[PDB]
């Protein structure tokens, strides 16, 4: 819980608990007992809804796909949906198992093949690569059930890189890849339908659990432009004769006059 408020009478002190220093890079400890006359207040609120586990552990949407010919593919990443990508880009390193739930409006009999990294996925339905011996697969009938399965932390390091300030190839190389793109791939999910019944919309809800965030950061203050790319200059009109005009798309509203708001 949060601490209670202590009483505070009139104080005439020579050590001001108000005059701090912003330059020292430390925040002030000034509680309202230092500025005014407080009363004892049994305060029992908790920030239990703010800890990383309950903050991120809510099973948001990570990606949508569309079964074209009873087949669709999705490479696991949080980079497509800005709302959850921002909550992740709060922190630098994150370590979490994830719990994938598939909300599909299809009807019939579907199959999900979690392709671990480094192998070839089925390039279409009724491919030979679907008969797999070791690639873990999930069968389900969308009516009567939502398929769900946990992927443990597949990291190749002690955490996930939300931001990576490095490359993967040495200096003189030519196809160097900035960012977190090479640092990790979580495989991919290949969906197919064995029947013909339902729609084609598949939503992948992923819930980070057993989270352990590592380095806080300034939350993203600009709308994204690409994935894995942390650009923010939006090039809105590529066709017209202004393509070289780059919007900014921030969220700082302006007020008409200071000292009047």
């Amino acid at each position: 819980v949060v601490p209670d408020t202590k009483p505070s009478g009139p104080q005439h002190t020579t050590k001001p608990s108000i005059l701090g220093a912003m330059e020292i890079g430390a925040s002030s400890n000034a509680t309202p007992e230092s500025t005014i006359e407080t009363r004892y207040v049994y305060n029992t609120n908790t920030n239990a809804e703010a800890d990383v586990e309950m903050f991120l552990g809510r099973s948001a949407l990570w990606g949508k796909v569309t079964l074209t010919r009873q087949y669709a593919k999705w490479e696991i990443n949080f980079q497509e949906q800005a709302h959850i990508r921002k909550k992740f880009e709060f922190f630098t390193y994150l370590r979490f198992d994830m719990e994938v739930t598939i909300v599909t409006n299809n009807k019939g009999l579907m199959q999900i093949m979690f392709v671990p990294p480094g192998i070839d996925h089925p390039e279409t339905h009724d491919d030979r690569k679907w008969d797999s011996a070791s690639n873990p697969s999930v069968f389900f009938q969308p009516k009567s059930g939502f398929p769900r399965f946990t992927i443990p932390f597949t990291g190749l390091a002690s955490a996930y890189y939300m931001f990576y300030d490095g490359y993967d190839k040495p200096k003189g190389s030519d196809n160097n890849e900035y960012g977190i793109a090479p640092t990790n791939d979580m495989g991919l999910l290949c969906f197919r339908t064995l029947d013909n019944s339902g729609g084609n919309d598949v939503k992948i809800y992923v819930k980070p659990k057993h989270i352990t965030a590592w380095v806080p950061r300034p939350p993203r203050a600009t709308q994204y432009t690409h994935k894995y790319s942390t650009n923010y200059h939006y090039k809105p009109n590529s066709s017209g004769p202004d393509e070289h005009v780059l919007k900014d798309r921030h969220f700082i509203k302006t007020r008409p006059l200071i000292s009047s708001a």
Partner: peptide
């Protein structure tokens, strides 16, 4: 507190602010 899948990664959700706000020597 039962774990029905007999595995750690299958469990549900698990459970000092001076590292920031005072990182002085």
């Amino acid at each position: 507190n039962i774990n029905y899948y007999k595995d750690s990664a299958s469990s549900g959700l698990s459970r000092d602010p001076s590292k920031f706000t005072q990182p002085l020597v």
